[model samples]
Target: MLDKQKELDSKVRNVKDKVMCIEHEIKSLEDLQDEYDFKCKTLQNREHEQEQLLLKKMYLMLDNKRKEVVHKIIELLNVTELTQNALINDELVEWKRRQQSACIGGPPNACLDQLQNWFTIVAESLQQVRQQLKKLEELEQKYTYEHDPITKNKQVLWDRTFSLFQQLIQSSFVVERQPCMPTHPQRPLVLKTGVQFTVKLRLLVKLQELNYNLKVKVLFDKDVNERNTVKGFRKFNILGTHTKVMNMEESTNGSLAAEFRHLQLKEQKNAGTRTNEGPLIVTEELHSLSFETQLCQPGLVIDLETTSLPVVVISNVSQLPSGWASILWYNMLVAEPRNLSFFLTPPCARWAQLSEVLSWQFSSVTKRGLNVDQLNMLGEKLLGPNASPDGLIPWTRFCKENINDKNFPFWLWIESILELIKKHLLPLWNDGCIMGFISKERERALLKDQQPGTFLLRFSESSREGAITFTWVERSQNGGEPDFHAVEPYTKKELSAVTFPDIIRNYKVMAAENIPENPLKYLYPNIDKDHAFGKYYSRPTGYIKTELISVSE
Candidate 1:
């Protein structure tokens, strides 16, 4: 078997060698054929040139022969009277035939009549052709002049039109108008002077390919007045302003937002009014806000964009529920790490004062609404006096400024402060409540095995809002923190079975006058003081209390 296999292998090599030789020979023949075809193309071009020269020579010979015949005829006509009369008669007949042909569209037309002879008409037509040639040359020179700079770099004129079309993907930049808060007695006076505006630039392309450099400017078209300059850009972690920007390449989000507070038009203080008794203070009107997105490169801009949103400078500030403010603040506070109380101080004061004013207006006997006189009496304390119109204070501007100061940790602090400001405007989230206790055993157990419900009594308004908070608390933990699930639903019977611990139950009686007792307020049984996981509990004092509604939301 070994001998036979060896013999077959040898036979196969012999066939392979023969196949290679044949393939090489075929490739050589193909190369020779390609050379022959190239030479034939060159010969064909030369042959074409020779044919053109031969045709020109034939035309010249024919023209010379006609001229010789004409000369012979002329000589005969000049000598013989009979021949001369015959030639003159032929010329008259031919001239009449030409006259009839030229008269097709009426020979009395200006060109034919002015020239009087067909030969002269031909000469004038040639002159007009020369005039058209001169006009074309002038046009050509102007076109080249216009393109001179572009021509310097050949690529500049290359019709990248299709490429420009490809890059047409762009998000519509929109600006949301922030109206004055009219519900608050003090806010309207200040807000009526300027507007609160938010800008959102959504990406029309993939996240990594987006590049946007934007600016917001104020422009007045109808009058000779200046629009209000942006005093400060509002800080919402999701948005940005021209002053504060992030690197585009690193941005992972699909869009960006920017909020601006107290955007006011500059006044022409010395300009005239109706009487002009003195240099009257001119109230500059806000015509429009120009949002321009210019080309920035490290790039080429296929689409340069600018847009404007129609704005009524002092539009009404819709009144929102005071509870809305509480929810807004609470969501913000619970959204971040640890307690946000560190960043809430500045804006909270402002909101608290404003909340007091709102509460008064609700209880006060005067229902006609906040009059101009009342707005005037508040002074700078309630209504910020530095405001642009009528000494109105730019309270939002002040609040935003207080929140956005450089000293704060911008990314985290901005959200914290804004929420606090929002929270300050309201009292409590709701009359409904949730109560639970921290488990010393669960808080100290292996993080993966522990329950999250062991922390503070999870006071919440509704199940869904409560779930969002619980989920947040669950995620915001390290090994030192414990795991927990949300507290379960309860009934009135469960409420009766549970007794409130004096310390944890936010001190007011469980059954307040108008408010019914929330069954979910009943606390779970406390774990024994010496429980196994008690050592890891978050409460340093080994005791935790139920948090009651601090303010009326």
Candidate 2:
């Protein structure tokens, strides 16, 4: 009985202690809550004040920029006035000299008519010069010389002003394809030879509507120089930089062949490796370096081709040559004929596959990137769809506007793709749901609109294939204009026979057109004339000269 009473007493004491601890915890939590509330309110008030200050500063800065812009305009006007005044004085001097010459002649009347005619010519020339000068002046007015610089110092003030508030600005560029995941693993979660999907890309930055290009340059001596121009893609360097930009090149081999396919053969080497396997006793010798195996070895040559064709989409494979696959981006399926004259467009100039092309251009970075598509979609939802509209659309609109202003009948460009699709792909078109949301709202929520951004449009093919790729982008210019007459016309004279695959008597894989009707007229004119532009070269001619070497029995 004594032990039982002790146990009850102990339990009662334990319960009392527990109750006291709870009361203490409650009081502490209340105190912490009150402290937090006070701090939050204080911060809010401080931030509001700072924001107003920033707004004032920003307004002042904007005003300063505006004033500078006006000053530049005034300076331009002054320079133009000086030029006009100088021209007027020159005309007067010319007129005085002519008048003196006419007076020197006994028959002043004869010179009078000539002098008037000469003055008329001089006056017309002056008018033309004046018009040209006016254009220059207008140019000066439109572009202010100041490079935009953020007050590079003390963004702390700006940061504090918006401290708790998230930045709502969207970066102008699409998120790198590699950031699709928290970490890109050894291999990508998904792989694609071809496909696309929609993703959310944070426009959490200021983006220039201007397009930037990546010019990949490759410099080679005689040893590797031959490799510079491959079957369909060529590497080129810009005039000022040794760096080769892939976009500027006629061919980008890395874009397609998952493994860099060997295309340089002194000729096109069929872009295939020569392999032989059989029971071969070492009659001569066994060289470690030589690729001759004595037993049965399996070798397969595969080519990757992509169009709008839908055959249950195949997953990524090591077999496909990336040179052929690069078509996903820059569009040309083969190396352009370097010396050949041909305009660039479509199969030659590169259209239609620009989005895919960019992925390919940066495939090295994007092949293993995180899915920015989801983020991009979210961004678009928050920012407003129109905010991320294609730069091409704006450029084309600009062109149309310019033409209309010039009083020219704007001719809508009709490409062969329309006809090509009409004949080949129309039957393949199937209806499907195009899913979209209010990108601006969704994007804003994700990015918190502290920064604006874009909702990424995933490559439709990439989405289906589960493979996302990346390539840099280049924008259309001169009102979305394209080079139309870059490549020379391909004729039957360029046709050569391929003895392989049952002797193609006259195989003409590519041909330049003679004139506008020839189709290449819509291509860029300055493009190289190398055989890269979809032209097939004869098979390897070393030991096995032709595809079909005849063995007379």
Candidate 3:
């Protein structure tokens, strides 16, 4: 009985202690709740005060300062539009001009940096205007009672601004790199069938959000109406991956670009009928590729497109020179974009303009430009003996007609010389050892006064396959009239076997008693031949070898 009573007492005491602990926990919970409630009330009061201040400011802004803000935005829009016009009209036009000059081997085209700057500026302005308009709309939605007649005006301006922004993005798409073959670096807009080429599309609006959102698509000869105008123009299907997503490049400008690196062109097999074939030769046919993409963003969707410069399509390597001639001639005459049918009624090129481009060709290849005297010689060769300084050279006469009695045109002959100089004579040409282009009469006049055995090198006028000949004057035995003798011109085949410098060092002429002697003692203007060409000679000095046979009259 005693033990039972003690157990009951213990259980009662334990239950009483548990209840006291529960009471203490409840008291702490109530204190925490009161603290949280006080914090919530304080936050609500602060929010209310902030809302009142915002309401007052918004009211003042809408009633008194709204016009000024709107006016500033309008002014910003005006300035942005002005900058857009200046970029497109002035800067873009200048870039195109430089590109045209580059086609004919002028200075390189380097407008992407300036283009990126203009693009970013315009995009930033448009984005800022968009944010301002959105804030105005949000403010009007929050305060329904705030009504001004300018609400409608703001909506109208927003629509206008949105449309302008869309237009800007659409027009900003450009062909950053023209279609070019790997074989011809730094030369663009000429494509060969079945050959891989590269081109690039760029979105001038350099928004990070735009990266990977726009897929660029390439199309060759997109316009049917334009193609039909050129009668028998060739049709081609773009090969390789024609579609690519624009991505941010790892460059300082962070330009969004889609580079089609391994793209190729395949000539269509069955190109309809050749019923109304035009007068344009195969090399004269000009074509273009178009790049397009659509940008889908919230509240806006725009289709953007840009076309490459007109390009010449050639199948055979032999036609490359003619195709290049067409390129130079067309770009020289026409500055208007996408003039695909330019060769249909091709205009004449002024000698003044054509001569400059011709000179640029040599400098472009060999880093040596033709002087006025050389240009005079070329001018006479093309425009005839008594041709005016500013004469016009017809397309037929320049590139089509076989004026040289050879199967090739006048331009091909000149291009062959350019190739010769570029391939075999670069060293001599760079050192100005070769006079390059001079009339026979002028050569006689320059060499007659010089010392005996004084020689000068000149390009062969009669050789269709490009040749270099050296003419030297020798005093007669009886001291009568000086004798001028020219060896047979050295063609590419001969130069390939023996370097020009070695040929000059080893050159010998038949003297009295059929003995051979070196005739070339000095270069023109009385510089020793050895001194002028010693460094360039391959063989060591005084190293006798098997003598090359000599034949002279």
The C-alpha RMSD in Å for every predicted model, in order, reads: 31.7, 37.2, 18.3
lDDT of 3 by residue, 218-251 (tens): 8888874656665566678988988888889643
Better of 2 and 3 by lDDT: 3
The whole-model C-alpha lDDT of candidate 1 against the native structure comes to: 0.30
Point out the higher-scoring one by lDDT: 1 or 2: 1
TM-score of 1: 0.23
The lDDT of model 3 is 0.74
Q: Which residues of candidate 2, in runs, are more than 4 Å off?
A: 1-224, 228-316, 319-325, 332-429, 434-553
For model 3, state the Cα shift of residue 412 in Å.
Answer: 0.9
TM-score of each: 0.23, 0.14, 0.84
Instruction: Give the Cα lDDT of each candidate.
Output: 0.30, 0.25, 0.74
Worst 10 residues of 2 by lDDT: 285-294
Q: Write the per-residue lDDT of candidate 1 for residues 266-300, one digit (tens) a residue.
A: 33434333223333121111233344444344534
Residue 200 deviation, candidate 1, in Å?
3.7
Query: In lDDT terms, which candidate is top?
Result: 3
TM-score of 3: 0.84
On residues 153-254, what C-alpha lDDT tens digit does candidate 2 reach at each position? Answer: 124323321221111111011111210112212122122222331111111111121112222221212132223332232222212223322221232321
